[PDB]
Amino acid sequence: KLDRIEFDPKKGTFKYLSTYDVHSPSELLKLLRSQVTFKGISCKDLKDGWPQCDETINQLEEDSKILVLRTKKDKTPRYVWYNSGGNLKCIDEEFVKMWENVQLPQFAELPRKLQDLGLKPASVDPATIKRQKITNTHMTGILKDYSHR
Amino acid sequence: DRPIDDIVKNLLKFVVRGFYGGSFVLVLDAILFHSVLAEDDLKQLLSINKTELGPLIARLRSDRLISIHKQREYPPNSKSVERVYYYVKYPHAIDAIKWKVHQVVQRLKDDLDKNSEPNGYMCPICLTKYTQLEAVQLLNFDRTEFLCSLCDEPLVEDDSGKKNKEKQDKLNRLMDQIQPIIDSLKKIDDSRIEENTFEIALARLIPPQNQSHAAYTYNPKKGSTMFRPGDSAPATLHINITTASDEVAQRELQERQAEEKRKQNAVPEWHKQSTIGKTALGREERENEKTLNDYYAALAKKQALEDEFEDV
Amino acid sequence: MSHSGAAIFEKVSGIIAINEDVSPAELTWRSTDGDKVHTVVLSTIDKLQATPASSEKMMLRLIGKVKPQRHMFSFNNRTVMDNIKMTLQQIISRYKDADIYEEKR
Amino acid sequence: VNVNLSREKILNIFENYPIVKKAYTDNVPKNFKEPEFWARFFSSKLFRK
Ligand SMILES: [Zn+2]
Known part of the structure; x- marks a missing residue:
């Protein structure tokens, strides 16, 4: 009667029914692509029924096929997502540091600077957004107001 | 979804994946x-902690890749709570990305220009930098060595003489790695994007959870003249098929309508005739057909929950 | 698109879609997790009620022709609600006209 | 808006536009009835074209 067990009438067996039937990277990729929301699939229950999962998950992480959220105490895969973008690593740290160092000017002043540098600014300063004795009464309740035609 | 929307989504994804960590990618991909x-x-x-989510949201808000919207929500059977929503304001994000890319490229170019200049000098003791021009006025009386002012010690030639090629290599690498952003920005400039708002974004919402506590609705207060910084942006067809009976009926109805029309425009009876002498006003073939059919058949054989609601 | 959107059914958030490829056209609401699925044949719908635009509620009801069946859907965005409502009105009117023709003939 | 049709006009439409006949013959007995077919045709862009 329990739902975690599958019955095989051909031989009459009781086999375990894993939560996510994944035993191959292709199956994992298709399962992650089939998700209708951005809720990651837990590695705790993915590992159950799969003799090895960390190896495959790392192989896909290096290939940038999926997104992996790893633990902090030690590198260990947790909830994973489908990588709808491109390569997970495409910029050097020497440039990431410069990007972090760059500080954006004031929001109201950004478009003016972008226009001064000759680059078309896709925004405007919010300060410029302009906000924007009735005689007969026996007929009372009868006359509809045909005010206009 | 519009192709320009797809292009801008790809640009945001690439920027986040390349210039930010992994948790940033997770958060922004969820919000996209x-x-x-x-x-x-x-x-x-x-499945991340509040403390972990904090830095990610803060950095993305500082970079304007994510916008915030706070509003008061009143659950029917719980105390109201101010819920925070996160979305992407595409014009602001695109402007920030463009400005940051330009600034990074300009910084590297200026660094190359500066490195192309002479080295300079340094003092080992006081760790003070002296330009060539500033050092030329501190040389000793013997015209043999440059002496520091505070320390009165020989100066040492500065570094960066050999990096001339390294900076150029860095620029060459960076342009190639940042190529996609430039093309996406070109397409974005070709197109025109409309600024996003909380209400507008709610139109494309995909519910995260079956029973999410947050009420994903925008109910602005009535007659609220309060303005907050950066909170504003720039029939039925019916067909009728006719039959022979309907045709005869339609002609009959048209005849009746014509009769009524002529009656409406006709003069009254009193006006028609002079009413002087009136008193003053005051208080069988079926068997024939059957035998026909039988005879022709013989011939052929011979030859062969209550609330307001509006109806719409 | 105008054939799908976010909607809430029986206090459960999900996605509502209009399937027209298979005749007769049917309206299907599926929960986010997929545990709950509801399908209604539009031929049974008698009238289409909608909340006024002057009310904070975004409800839309489909009453089935006869203890008549009643289906209630709650929306999140007024634009989405209107876009769904026009498309639903077209199909409901066409089916009612077809039923009228069949009864008349 | 009410539009009136007749058998003679239906035959004329079929004679003048073979595409309408092609889409009518293969769909009237299979998917939907003739009234629904005509309503969909009138609402469609094909009639406008
Ligand atoms: Zn010194």
């Missing part, structure tokens, strides 16, 4: 897959 996303829903989706 969904529309405005509540704080609790985001936490449940990514």
Whole structure:
């Protein structure tokens, strides 16, 4: 009667029914692509029924096929997502540091600077957004107001 | 979804994946897959702590890749709570990305120009930098060595003489790696994008959870003249098929309408005739057909929950 | 698109879609997790009620022709609600006209 | 808006536009009835074209 067990009438067996039937990277990729929301699939229950999962998950992480959220105490895969973008690593740290160092000017002043540098600014300063004795009464309740035609 | 929307989504994804860590990618990909996303829903989706989510949201808000919207929500059977929603304001994000890319490229170019200049000098003791011009006025009386002012010690030639090629290599690498952003920005400039708002983004919402506590609705207060910084942006067809009976009926109805029309325009009876002498006003073939059919058949054989609602 | 959107059914958030490829056209609401699925044949719908635009509620009801069946859907965005409502009105009117023709003939 | 049709006009439409006949013969007995077919045709862009 329990739902975690599958019955095989051909031989009459009781086999375990894993939560996510994944035993191959292709199956994992298709399962992650089939998700209708951005809720990651837990590695705790993915590992159950799969003799090895960390190896495959790392192989896909290096290939940038999926997104992996790893633990902090030690590198260990947790909830994973489908990588709808491109390569997970495409910029050097020497440039990431410069990007972090760059500080954006004031929001109201950004478009003016972008226009001064000759680059078309896709925004405007919010300060410029302009906000924007009735005689007969026996007929009372009868006359509809045909005010206009 | 519009192709320009797809292009801008790809640009945001590339920028986040290349210039930010992994948790940033997770958060922004969640907020791109969904529309405005509540704080609790985001936490449940990514299974990350509040303290961990803090830095990511803060950095993305500082870079203007994510916008914030706070509003008061009144549950029917719980105390009202101010819920925070996160979405992407495409014009602001694109402007920030463009400005940051330009600034990085300009910084590297200026560094190359500066490195192309002479080295300079340094003092080992006081760790003071002296330009060539400033050092030329501090040389000793013997015209043999440059002496420091505070320390009165020989100066040492500065470094960066050999990096002339290294900086050029760095620029060459950076342009190639940053190529996609430039093309995406070209397409974005070709197109025109409309600024996003909380209400507008709610139109594309994909519910995160079955029973999410946050009410993903925008109910602005009536007659609220309060303005906050950066909170504003720039029939039925019926067909009728006719039959022979309907045709005869239609002609009959048209005849009746014509009769009524002529009666309406006709003069009254009193006006028709002079009413002087009137008193003053005051208080069988079926068998024939059957035998026909039988005879022809013989011939052929011979030859062969209550609330307001509006009806619409 | 105008054939799908976010909606809430029986206090459960999900996605509502209009399937027209298979005749007769049917309206299907599926929960986010997929545990709950509801399908209604539009031929049974008698009238289409909608909340006024002057009310904070975004409800839309489909009453089935006869203890008549009643289906209630709650929306999140007024634009989405209107876009769904026009498309639903077209199909409901066409089916009612077809039923009228069949009864008349 | 009410539009009136007749058998003679239906035959004329079929004679003048073979495409309408092609889409009518293969769909009237299979998917939907003739009234629904005509309503969909009138609402469609094909009639406008
Ligand atoms: Zn010194």
